[PDB]
Every structure is written in C-alpha cells, then in structure tokens.
C-alpha cells in the first residue's frame, strides 16, 4: 500500500507564504477575540494555528471577534490566527449529487473526496426584480393534499410549519422521492435536483434519512448537506447558505433545483447563540435584530429566473417547528411573512387518521391556480370548493341526522373527500393518478360507498388503472388536460369499476 | 473640538486614550523626544517604595496625591506637558495604570521613528554570522527608511527551519508545521 | 477493506513517528540556507 501513499505525499502543496496574522487575546464559549488582523474583511475565513477555522464576524475597533468552527479546546490565549483573504465559499457542481457534505462542502460520507471544480461564495445577493419571471410551472410533490389544494410551483417559497412529530420531514422526503420519475425520464425541463439541508438533527436521523433515499434510489440526484446537533454553532448558522449556494449553481445554470431546510428554527437558535456570545444587543425572545434579515436574505434566493438568464429555478421548503400551534412566536411569524405559502400540519388531524396531517383550513399558497396542470386544476377547483363547504358545517357532523338533506349531502361528500386525501408514507403518485382518483371522488362516484371502504377503493382503483389503461393516463399526462373524450373515458372506467366492487 | 494629530499606531483602552492625547499634544510644540525622556524618568520615580506605596492606598485624599505629585514634579523639573499629564492621571484616579500609558507611548514613538518589530524563532541555537545574513535579508522587507529591531529567540520545541514575524507579516517555515501539513494532506 | 484500512492507518503513524525522530539529525545548515533563499523569493514577490 506504501506504493499508494507516496503519491498521497507527492500530491501536496509545501510552499509557504507571507501572510498577515493576529494573536488570540481570549477564548471561551466558542468565541475567539483575535487581536491584530488589521486588514481582515468582515465575514472572512481565518485559520487558527492548531488547524481549526473561524469566520471573523465582529470587527471591533481594537480586536476582531472570530467564531470558531469547532471545539475551541484546541485554542489557547496566545495562539496565532492567520487570515486567508477569502469570504466563506463552498464547492458546487454536479459532482455533489449523491454525496453527503457538511456545512463547508467536505464529504462526511467517506466514499471518496468531492471532485468539484468550481467554488462559489455563500453571501451572494438574490436575483433582482427583472431577472425573475412569474411562477408558472408546477412542482409535483406527489402528495394528494399538497398537490391539489395547496399547490407548489417552481420558484416559490412554501413554508412547511407544524408542531413536533406531525410529519414535516416526511412530506419533504415524499417530495424528494417523487422526483425520481422525472429524473429518470428524458425531458430536462422537468428534472428537479433536490437538496436537503439537515440542521440540528442528530447523525442517526440523517443516517436513517440517507438510508431511505438510497433504498428509494433517490440519491443519484440529491445532495444532503448536514450541520448536525454536535457541530459548533457556526456550522449550523452556515449550512443553509451552503445548501442555497449549491442550489444557486443549478438555478443560474438553466437547471431546476429544490432545497429543503430542516429546520430553520434551529439555524435561528444557532445564530442567537453566536450573537449573544459575541455580546450583540438582544431583542425579543433574545434573538438579535438580524433574525429577520438572516432568513429573508436566504429565502429570497429561491427564484424562477426568466428565459434570458437561463430559465433555471430554485424552490424552497423551509421546515418550521411551532411550540404547540403558537404560530405567533417570533420565528414562525418572521418566516411566515417571508414565504409565499404555508402547509400547516396539526396533531389533532394526525391522530384522527388524516395522514399526512395537513390542515387545509390554514394552509394556503399565494400562487394558487397557477402552478397546477390544467387537469389537476379542473379537478381541484371543485374539490377545494366542496371541502370549503364541508368544513364550515362539519360542526354538525356529530349529529348529521336531524338535519336537512342538503347538509347531509355536504357531509357525505366532505367525508369521502377527506378519506381520499389520506395517503401512505413514501408513496407519492404521479399527477395523472391523482387526477383519476380525485375525479372518481368529486364527481359523485363514491357518495353511495361507505366511508370506511374508500381507502380500499382508492388503492384498488389505482392498481386497476395503472395496469389496464396506461394509454388513457398517458393521454392525460402528455397534454395536461381532460379533453371531453378523456373525460368520458374516465367516467366509464370509474362507473364500470365501481359496479364490479 | 480642536483638530488633533493622530499617532502612527492606534492603542486602545485607557492607556490608549491617554497616550493618544499626550502624543498629539507633544507633536504640537515638537517636544516628543524630551517627552519620552521624561516619561521614562517618571517610570522609575513612580517605583520608589514610598511613592509606589502612597499611590496605591485609596485612603490618601485625592488632593493629597495630586499635591505630592506636583511637588515631586517640581524637583524632577519636568516639561509642562509631562507634569500636566502626571497631574491629569492623578486626579482622574487612573495613575494605577501609569506604566500602561508610558509603555503605549513608547510603542507610539517607536513607530513614529520607524522601527518595525521583528522576531526570528529558530529550531535551536543560532550562530551570529547567520544572524548577520538574517538581518541583511529581512531589511529587504521594510519600506524606504524603516529600521529593524530583531529579537531572536531559541526554540527546540519546533523541529527545524524558522518562524519569522515582521510587524504582522508572519512566515512559518518550521519543519514541524511541514510535518503536520503533510500528514494532513496525505490523510 | 478492513485489513487495508488497518494497514494504511498504521503505516502513516509508524512512519510519521519515525520522521519526528529522524529530524533530530544535523541537517541544520541546509534548512537555514533554504529558508534564507525562501526569504529572498518572498521579499522579491512581496512588493
């Protein structure tokens, strides 16, 4: 093996340089107070002698407050900090796809090193007002509720907000898995290069996640950044920008990306620690004054460039955890007033059996009708109106009888639609199968079928349409509308099938 | 307020403010060199056991300390600037850190006359002919006029080569760092 | 794999520990001359 390690030695850079330098005055809690570094740019990567990094965050008149990228056990008052001249930057490209990188783009997967050629800053500005063009394409998440009632176009920030253990990461992972059908096909105007930033999670959780993605063979197009719970505060404050830059590469390279921060309410906590230790003035809930600028300058990179800047895109699905439906806390409102929507998840719905536990009453998308295909648009308009009518008179549900036949009809329709929206886990469905199911649901081809059985029907119907009438589904998919011929054919399939069951 | 001439180097804290004030006031009236002489003198004059003992007790009325400083500064016959500075420090109560002031002022005058700090940490003992070549080559880094004030230091803790500091510029060619760099690169 | 990982991770430590005691020889003059040349080059390229 020694024959192999001598090219390891040869492939080095032994040269030295005349570099600037300061000396640590203080250290503790993860915050060095370097003295010197007279020509240090704000937000620049300095290197301590022992080997760590640091990001010279707080240029005070006499000393520079640097934040160590790791345990400062290795640092002592007296050490030498040598500046590098470079703002924080990270590798990018398509070499990352399928890897697992940490906050600074260093493969923590073993599995060899990253072979990226091009690097890129992390503190770039979002594209202006002219580069963008209106949000028009849909991002099929593969989830019935999300994909019909609260649509998600490409280039749109869509908060996924909800209490703990309601199925937020599950929605994001179903979204990631669904893109397989696109990323295996041919057209390059439908390929989504998912990214998944894992902040504050424990490495066991990220490991299980990458196991899910590998089982579903959904890593060949996914990057998985990870600033896990044990990584010092700066590496969690900085992971979302690493992810967003890895995605900006695609966006400005005429490709379509998708980035999922999980959570952002832990990047905010990491930044609060970084600030409170640097002694910056606190504010409400102890967050600094930048905890809006922080997120805003992040969730405003998710754009949809026009056709002169390439036509790329970058969706964004920040996951937020709210303490017992306290949507009025500081961070939930900071990140609810930046994004274009919200997919609210609730635990009353998760245990009633409505999984995914989406709460269509509170969930909205501010693109709306656009960001849907004409087929799903036709179906979901009526579905949305019917569900809205149901919700406002669901209070009588516990009675039902003793009431007018009109509200009895409304309940007998809303119940079926609610049961149709229930979905499995890691079982996303192509748009045309969603259209088929919800067509069979909203046109009355179940009102006479007892609610308890609807789920059965659903699955059965799918298996009876996937393996039988693939031609019809292809007709619906290739041109995303229901031409009267396709409408009547769907009616016949639904009716005759229901008859034989 | 009145325009004041900034020092060449900036020192910060209490000593920073006092040294900057004194340096700017001395630059006017051009009494810098004699001011530094008097500062060195007060250095020792404030280390005699009786003076250094009565200028730490906080139960000596402030006016008593100010008057004793005035009397001592008559005998030593200081310039008006230095006597005024000693007074000032006396009644602001900040004379406990007089050594910080003068020291800072020295660093403020050294850079004024242009003697950049330097340093050469060596792997082990060093010859003096080697020191001659070292000085003659480091003089290649200065600007046109500066002077070199090299403080050699022996260090066997490093492995080989040397570490050279010049002002801030820090060049590290010690074999130790080469070893850790190589191990890092090939790990 | 496991055997190769063990082998290489021991090779590296063994040889580096040999080197950290091999440097104690008397090659000082060569190092000093090389470093003075490096000063020459840095000063030249530093302006």
């Amino acid at each position: 093996v020694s024959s192999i390690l001598e090219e390891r030695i040869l492939g080095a850079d032994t040269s030295v340089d005349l570099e600037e330098t300061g000396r640590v005055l203080s250290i503790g809690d993860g915050i060095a107070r370097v003295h010197g570094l007279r020509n240090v740019q704000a937000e620049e990567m300095v290197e301590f002698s022992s080997g760590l990094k640091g990001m010279s965050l707080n240029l005070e008149p006499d000393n520079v407050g640097v934040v160590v990228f790791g345990n400062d056990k290795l640092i002592k008052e007296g050490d030498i900090v040598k500046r590098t001249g470079a703002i924080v930057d990270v590798p990018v490209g398509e070499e990352l796809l399928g890897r697992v990188v940490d906050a600074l783009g260093n493969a923590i997967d073993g599995k060899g090193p990253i072979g990226s050629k091009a690097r890129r800053r992390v503190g770039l500005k979002a594209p202006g007002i002219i580069p963008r063009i209106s949000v028009r394409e849909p991002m099929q998440t593969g989830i019935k509720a999300v994909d019909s009632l609260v649509p998600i176009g490409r280039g749109q920030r869509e908060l996924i907000i909800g209490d703990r253990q309601t199925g937020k990461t599950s929605i994001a992972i179903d979204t990631i898995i669904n893109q397989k059908r696109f990323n295996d096909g041919t057209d390059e105007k439908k390929k989504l290069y998912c990214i998944y930033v894992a902040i504050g999670q424990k490495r066991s959780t990220v490991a299980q996640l990458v196991k899910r993605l590998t089982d579903a063979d959904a890593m060949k197009y996914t990057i998985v950044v990870s600033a896990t719970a044990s990584d010092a505060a700066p590496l969690q404050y900085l992971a979302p920008y690493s992810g967003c830059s890895m995605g900006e590469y695609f966006r400005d390279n005429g490709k379509h990306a998708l980035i999922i921060y999980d959570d952002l309410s832990k990047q905010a906590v990491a930044y609060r620690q970084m600030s409170l230790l640097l002694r910056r003035p606190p504010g409400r809930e102890a967050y600094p004054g930048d905890v809006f600028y922080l997120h805003s300058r992040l969730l405003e990179r998710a754009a949809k460039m026009n056709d002169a800047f390439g036509g790329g895109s970058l969706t964004a699905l920040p996951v937020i955890e709210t303490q017992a439906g306290d949507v009025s806390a500081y961070i939930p409102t900071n990140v609810i007033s930046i994004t274009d929507g919200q997919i609210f998840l609730e635990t009353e719905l998760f245990y009633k059996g409505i999984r995914p536990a989406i709460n269509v009453g509170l969930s909205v998308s501010r693109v709306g009708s656009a960001a849907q295909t004409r087929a799903m648009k036709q179906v979901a308009g009526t579905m949305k109106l019917e569900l809205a009518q149901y919700r406002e008179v669901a209070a009588f549900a516990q009675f039902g009888s003793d009431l007018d036949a009109a509200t009895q009809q409304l309940l007998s329709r809303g119940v079926r639609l609610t049961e149709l929206l229930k979905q499995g886990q890691y079982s996303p469905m192509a748009i045309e199968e969603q259209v088929a199911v919800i067509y069979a649901g909203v046109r009355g081809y179940l009102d006479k079928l007892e609610p308890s059985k609807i789920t059965k029907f659903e699955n059965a119907f799918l298996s009876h349409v996937i393996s039988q009438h693939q031609a019809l589904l292809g007709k619906i998919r290739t041109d995303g509308k229901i031409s009267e011929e396709s409408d009547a054919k769907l009616k016949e399939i639904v009716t005759n099938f229901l008859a034989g069951f | 307020f009145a325009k004041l001439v900034r020092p060449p180097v900036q020192i910060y804290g209490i000593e920073g403010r006092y040294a900057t004030a004194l340096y700017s006031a001395a630059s006017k009236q051009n009494k810098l060199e004699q001011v530094e002489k008097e500062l060195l003198r007060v250095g020792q004059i404030l280390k005699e056991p009786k003076m250094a003992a009565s200028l730490l007790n906080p139960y000596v009325k402030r006016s008593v300390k100010v008057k004793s400083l005035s009397d001592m500064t008559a005998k030593e016959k200081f310039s008006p600037l230095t006597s005024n500075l000693i007074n000032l420090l006396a009644e602001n109560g900040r004379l406990t850190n007089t050594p910080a002031v003068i020291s800072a002022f020295s660093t403020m005058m050294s850079v004024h006359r242009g003697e950049v700090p330097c340093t050469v940490t060596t792997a082990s003992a060093l010859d003096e002919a080697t020191l001659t070549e070292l000085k003659t080559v480091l003089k290649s880094f200065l600007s046109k006029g500066q002077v070199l004030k090299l403080e050699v230091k022996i260090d066997p803790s490093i492995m080989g080569g040397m570490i050279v500091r010049i002002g801030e510029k820090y060049v590290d060619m010690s074999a130790k760092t080469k070893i850790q760099k190589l191990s890092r690169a090939m790990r | 794999n496991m055997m190769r990982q063990k082998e290489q991770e021991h090779m590296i430590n063994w040889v580096e520990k040999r080197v950290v005691q091999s440097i104690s020889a008397q090659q000082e003059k060569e190092t000093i001359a090389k470093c003075i040349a490096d000063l020459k080059l840095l000063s030249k390229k530093a302006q």
Partner: peptide, 22 residues
C-alpha cells in the same frame, strides 16, 4: 523539485517502510 528536505524525507521513509513489507 529536489529542494524539499522533510517532504522527500517522508518519501524516502515510505520507500524504506514499503520494502519492509515482504
């Protein structure tokens, strides 16, 4: 290329420890 003392020292030591295997 020949200037490096400690680098090529590491290389020579690796050759020597390579021959030691066998």
């Amino acid at each position: 290329d020949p200037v490096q003392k400690l680098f090529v020292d590491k290389i020579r030591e690796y050759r020597t420890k390579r021959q030691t295997s066998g």
